[PDB]
Structure formats: C-alpha cells, structure tokens
A paper describes a structure:
Histamine is a biogenic amine that plays an important role in various physiological and pathophysiological conditions by activating four different G-protein coupled receptors (GPCRs), classified as H1R, H2R, H3R, and H4R1–3. Among them, H1R is widely distributed throughout the body in epithelial cells and smooth vascular, neuronal, glial, and immune cells. When activated by histamine released by mast cells or basophils, H1R can cause allergic and inflammatory symptoms and has therefore been extensively targeted in the development of antihistamines. Since H1R has a high basal signaling capacity, a prominent feature of many GPCRs, and all antihistamines have been shown to be inverse agonists rather than antagonists, how H1R obtains its constitutive activity and how it is blocked by antihistamines remain poorly elucidated.
Residue numbers in the entry: 29 to 55, 58 to 134, 139 to 170, 176 to 221, 408 to 481
Write the structure that this text describes.
C-alpha cells in the first residue's frame, strides 16, 4: 500500500528533476537561474540514493543493508541534505550580492562558491567515518551516535537553526532594500519566499521531532518518524514543483 506510493514518489521526483536538467542544458543558461541547478542536483541525490534505501529500510523493520553500505547511504543522506541547505543559503547570498554589491564576476565566482559549499558539505562524511577509530551492532542500520545527545543537538543547531536565522536576516535585508530602492523582482522575491516557506514548513516536523526525541521517555513514535522522513522527502520533491509554476519562461521551456 505505502511502498507503491513511495515508489511513485521516487519516479516522479527523478523524472521531473531529469527534465529540469534537460531544460537547463538545452537553454536561462545565464547569471539568472544560476544556483537552481544545485537544488536540482541535490534533489536528484536525495531521491535517487536515499529513497530506495529508505523504502528497503521501511518495508519491514530492520533489514540490514551492509555496514559499508549503511555508512555510505547515511553519508549521502546527510551531505545531500546539508548541501541543499547551504545551496539555498548561497543562492540567497548571491541574490543579495547581485542586488546590492554593484552599487559599491558573478559567473566566475559562482563555480568557486558551489564547490566550496560542496566541500564543506562533504567534510561531514569524516565524523561518520571515524567515531571510535581515532576519536575514542550489525542488524541495526543506524551506525551513528545515539548515546551522546548534546553532539546530536549541536549538529541539529548548525544544520537547521543557524541557516534558518541567516535566511530570515537575508529575507529582511532584501525586503528593506527593495522597499528603499522603489514587478519582475517582485515575482522573484515571491518565488524565493514560497521556496523558503515550503522548505521550513515541510522540513520543520522531523527536525523538531528528533530534537525533542534526542532525549525523552516517550520517544517510541517510529511511525511518525518515518512519516516525517517521507514528508521531508516530499518537500524536496516539491521544491522543483513550487519552482516552475512561478517562472513563466522556464514554464514554457519545460512545456516543450
């Protein structure tokens, strides 16, 4: 019942993101829409590499995937999540730059910034790779730290709440700059705000959920845990679904 729904979700996500990539390569193709490629590839990663592993983990309780396989799937999960987060962050920082800095280039620095974001995302693999090797179960497919709670909550902090406040600060700065300067820019701000809202609304449930469950006595809510997992994955799917409806140009692009 659920497995077919999640498989349909995966196929829709991969297909729509592949069509987005095909549209990007076919034509756009400028300073505008410069980092939505990063969101598209992040969604490709999360869908393609996590969703099959997630449905395998979910169809029954505790199928073991293999120790290196579980490590690598967890690594892709976390690095793709943080890469998408900071990809939105650097997209917003570049929009702020494009709107304010030329008062006081973009193409050549965009590649450097995206590779830097990818590198800072992929340095997250090292904590997972080494926990007892240098920094002193098999049926389970967590292979992470549960006993230490403050490290987990600190990781949650640095991966969600600091980017959230950076998003809010940048949104306020953009709004104030637009107000003091004065329809196309209004539409761009509206689509960015809708992406931010979908992001926050449909990724906050699991984040706060395991923030509370990082330590509790009523932590036995695994069904709602997996519900929030597939909810967040749906949000990752629908970010490139909220995106196309706002822009008419790329709308006509994928109409082809």
């Amino acid at each position: 019942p659920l497995v077919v729904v999640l498989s349909t979700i995966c196929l829709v996500t991969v297909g729509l993101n592949l069509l987005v990539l095909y549209a990007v390569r076919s034509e756009l193709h400028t300073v505008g829409n410069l980092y939505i490629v990063s969101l598209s590839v992040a969604d490709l990663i999360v869908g393609a590499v996590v969703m099959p592993m997630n449905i395998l983990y979910l169809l029954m309780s505790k199928w073991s995937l293999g120790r290196p396989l579980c490590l690598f799937w967890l690594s892709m999960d976390y690095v793709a999540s943080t890469a998408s987060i900071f990809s939105v962050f650097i997209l917003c920082i570049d929009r702020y730059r494009s709107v304010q800095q030329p008062l006081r280039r973009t193409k050549t620095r965009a590649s450097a910034t995206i590779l830097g974001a990818w590198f800072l995302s992929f340095l997250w693999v090292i904590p997972i790779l080494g926990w007892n090797h240098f920094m002193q179960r098999e049926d389970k497919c967590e292979t992470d730290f549960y006993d230490v709670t403050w490290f987990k909550v600190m990781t949650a902090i640095i991966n969600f709440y600091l980017p959230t406040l950076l998003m809010l600060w940048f949104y306020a700065k953009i709004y104030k700059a637009v107000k003091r300067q004065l329809n196309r820019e209004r539409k761009a701000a509206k689509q960015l705000g809708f992406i931010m809202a979908a992001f926050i609304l449909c990724w906050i449930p699991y984040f706060i959920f395991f923030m509370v469950i990082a330590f509790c006595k009523n932590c036995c809510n695994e069904h709602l845990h997996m519900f929030t997992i597939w909810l967040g994955y749906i949000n990752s799917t629908l970010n490139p679904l909220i995106y196309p409806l706002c822009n008419e140009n790329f709308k006509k692009t994928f109409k082809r």
